Amino acid sequence: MNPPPPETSNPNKPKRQTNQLQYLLRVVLKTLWKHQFAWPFQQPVDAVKLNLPDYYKIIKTPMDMGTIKKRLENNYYWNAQECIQDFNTMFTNCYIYNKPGDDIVLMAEALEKLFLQKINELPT
Ligand SMILES: CC(=O)Nc1cc(Cn2ccnc2)c2cccc(O)c2n1
């Protein structure tokens, strides 16, 4: 059984648009999205489809790039740091659920390096 995916809107949460959040959508996310190793991370983990019945028994803060993209499109975030924390939750989830050297981990590691390169300099 999959849990509900993370919210992409919340009327109790204030919205904001900043130059950095625009960049995180237009440049950072949409470039990572095209990476050859992006596809496992483009949607919430479907534990039923992927036969990972222990995934949500281990991962209690799920995050994926599909959710992040929708949050950026919704102006769900207050600032760029909030969005960056979601990326880091996504990468760390993969490292927590899996082991060093796993194919999926090698994929997340390559994406994390590209992500770090892209956020090294943000607009002002
Ligand atoms: C042990 C295990 O299956 N771990 C897996 C497998 C898949 C599905 N997958 C595998 C290769 N490409 C996509 C994952 C997909 C997304 C995030 C994960 O943490 C995953 N972890």
From Swiss-Prot:
Q: Describe the PTM.
A: Phosphorylation by CK2 disrupt the intramolecular binding between the bromo domain 2 and the NPS region and promotes binding between the NPS and the BID regions, leading to activate the protein and promote binding to acetylated histones. In absence of phosphorylation, BRD4 does not localize to p53/TP53 target gene promoters, phosphorylation promoting recruitment to p53/TP53 target promoters.
Record location of the Glycyl lysine isopeptide (Lys-Gly) (interchain with G-Cter in SUMO2) cross-link: K57
The source's domain of life comes to Eukaryota
Check the UniProt entry and state the signal peptide residues, or none: none
- Where is it located? Nucleus; Chromosome
Residues the record marks as site: Acetylated histone binding = N98
Domain Bromo spans what residues? Answer: 16-122
Q: What does this protein do?
A: Chromatin reader protein that recognizes and binds acetylated histones and plays a key role in transmission of epigenetic memory across cell divisions and transcription regulation. Remains associated with acetylated chromatin throughout the entire cell cycle and provides epigenetic memory for postmitotic G1 gene transcription by preserving acetylated chromatin status and maintaining high-order chromatin structure. During interphase, plays a key role in regulating the transcription of signal-inducible genes by associating with the P-TEFb complex and recruiting it to promoters.
Another remark in the UniProt entry says: JQ1, a thieno-triazolo-1,4-diazepine derivative, and I-BET, a benzodiazepine derivative, have been tested on tumors with success. Treatment with GSK1210151A (I-BET151, a I-BET derivative) has strong effets on mixed lineage leukemia and promotes myeloid differentiation and leukemia stem-cell depletion.
Instruction: Provide the domain comment.
Output: The NET domain mediates interaction with a number of chromatin proteins involved in transcription regulation (NSD3, JMJD6, CHD4, GLTSCR1 and ATAD5).
Supply the name of the protein: Bromodomain-containing protein 4
Provide the species name: Homo sapiens (Human)
Q: Which residues of the full protein are shown?
A: 44 to 166 of 1362
